[PDB]
Antibody, heavy 213, light 210 residues
Framework: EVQLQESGPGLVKPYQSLSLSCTVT?????????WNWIRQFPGNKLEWMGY???????DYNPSLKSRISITRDTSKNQFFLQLNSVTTEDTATYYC????????????WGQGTTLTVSSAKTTAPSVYPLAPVSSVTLGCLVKGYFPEPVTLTWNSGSLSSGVHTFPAVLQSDLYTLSSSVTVTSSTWPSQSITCNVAHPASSTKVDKKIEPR | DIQMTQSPAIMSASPGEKVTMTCSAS?????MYWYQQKPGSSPRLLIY???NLASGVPVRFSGSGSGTSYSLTISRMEAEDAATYYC?????????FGAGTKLELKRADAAPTVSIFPPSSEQLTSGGASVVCFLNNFYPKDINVKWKIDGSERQNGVLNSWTDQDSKDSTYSMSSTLTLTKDEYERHNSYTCEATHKTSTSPIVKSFNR
């Protein structure tokens, strides 16, 4: 089956250019259809950016076709997006999609890739444990990191029930995120419960055990 | 270059109800398209050409409209219909989409399980102090939390975050973090987190003293 996966930088400085790729498997970009580039967020607003057809080029870009360029590498089977003189207004998550012919619709979409345009510097998170309250709900606090995202698992992903990871809130160029996990009173503190945090952008990974302090 | 407005932005419905969302176009469009986007999954085409149902789409969905007004209706709502729906057009175009309508599932009221956390010693050594309050598994996403330090309501320095509706039980959760300086924290004694929700006339109070 056809999958489609995006790639590119997570953070880009203002006025620089942005480059993203879309790799497709299970189908060749030369056979048929036009595999496009679309962007969404933050307020859910969407914008179709352009497409490149199976015959190459024949591409179109919305009227904002002045800083954009979509190209392809038929030997590696992937198309690319080049946006220039990027600004803060360009932070969003990008999706590459395939437009089915005849039936005017997009039938295959990628996983999406988020791009932040900011002069702010990457900052590693401080991970704090939160030892527990009422039938034992424990927590983890990840604060002061930039940019998004961080990955948080409880006990190497083994524990998934009762978990609630709350979305990151930006408080002056820095982010703060948290998570709670509810377990039975008999489980903890005898059975260890550690919080696993990973922040790729600053290459930070830390395991924080919730001790009954 | 038509702008598409989907109203209502969000709505809830219980299984068995008749649902109807709308898509307005700044100027006439010749037949709209509707996509359904289940949380945590690719969008799927639902309706093509204003009324034509795509294959694999349940008969309960219908589409209608003409000119600058288009609507999506679900005769009978099913749990599995909770998702975001987008309208799209291509007539007088560059093609454009709408910002979607989030159809959430209505369910029985549920009060939150509140938990409070003093700041970790590790954090204190750095000179900062955050008090966290978790309010978990409650229905009307609408809840008001209050932070009180020695009786006074602290309204600044708080960050609130809710999770999307829970896949397994149509419930919500939220966290409220009160960040302070170590020295303002130690200059006080009681830290309270108060929740006011539809389920209780009196608020839920969770506190701790240093």
């Amino acid at each position: 089956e056809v999958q489609l996966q995006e790639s590119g930088p997570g953070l880009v400085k203002p006025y620089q250019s942005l480059s993203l790729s879309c790799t497709v498997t299970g189908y060749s970009i030369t056979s048929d259809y036009a595999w496009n580039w679309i962007r969404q967020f933050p307020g859910n607003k969407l914008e179709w950016m352009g497409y490149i057809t199976y015959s190459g080029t024949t591409d179109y870009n919305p009227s904002l076709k002045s800083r954009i360029s979509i190209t392809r590498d038929t030997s590696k089977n992937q198309f690319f997006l080049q946006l220039n003189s990027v600004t803060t207004e360009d932070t969003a998550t990008y999706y590459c999609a395939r437009y089915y012919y005849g039936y005017w619709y997009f039938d295959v979409w990628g996983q999406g890739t988020t791009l932040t345009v900011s002069s702010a510097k990457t900052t590693a998170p401080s991970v704090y444990p939160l030892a527990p309250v009422s039938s034992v709900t424990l927590g983890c606090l990840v604060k002061g990191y930039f940019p998004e995202p961080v990955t948080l698992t409880w006990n190497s992903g083994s524990l998934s029930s009762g978990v609630h990871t709350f979305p990151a809130v930006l408080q002056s160029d820095l982010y703060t995120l948290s998570s709670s996990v509810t377990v039975t009173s008999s489980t903890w503190p005898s059975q260890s419960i550690t919080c696993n945090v990973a922040h790729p952008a600053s290459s930070t990974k830390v395991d924080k055990k919730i001790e009954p302090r | 270059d038509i702008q598409m407005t989907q109203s209502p932005a969000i709505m809830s419905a219980s299984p068995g109800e008749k649902v109807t969302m709308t898509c307005s176009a700044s100027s006439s469009v010749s037949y709209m398209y509707w996509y359904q986007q289940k949380p945590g999954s690719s969008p799927r085409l639902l309706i093509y050409d204003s009324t034509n149902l795509a294959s694999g789409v349940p008969v309960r969905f219908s589409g209608s409209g003409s000119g600058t007004s288009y609507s999506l209706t679900i005769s009978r709502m099913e749990a599995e219909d909770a998702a975001t729906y987008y309208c799209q057009q291509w007539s007088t175009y560059p093609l454009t989409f709408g910002a979607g309508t989030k159809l959430e599932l209505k369910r029985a009221d549920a009060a939150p399980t509140v938990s409070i956390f003093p700041p970790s010693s590790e954090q204190l050594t750095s000179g900062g102090a955050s008090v966290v309050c978790f309010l978990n598994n409650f229905y009307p996403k609408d809840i008001n939390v209050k932070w009180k330090i020695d009786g006074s309501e602290r309204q600044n320095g708080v960050l609130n975050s809710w999770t999307d509706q829970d896949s397994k039980d149509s419930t919500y959760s939220m966290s409220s973090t009160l960040t302070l300086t170590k020295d303002e924290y130690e200059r006080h004694n009681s830290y309270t987190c108060e929740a006011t929700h539809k389920t209780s006339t009196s608020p839920i109070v969770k506190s701790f003293n240093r």
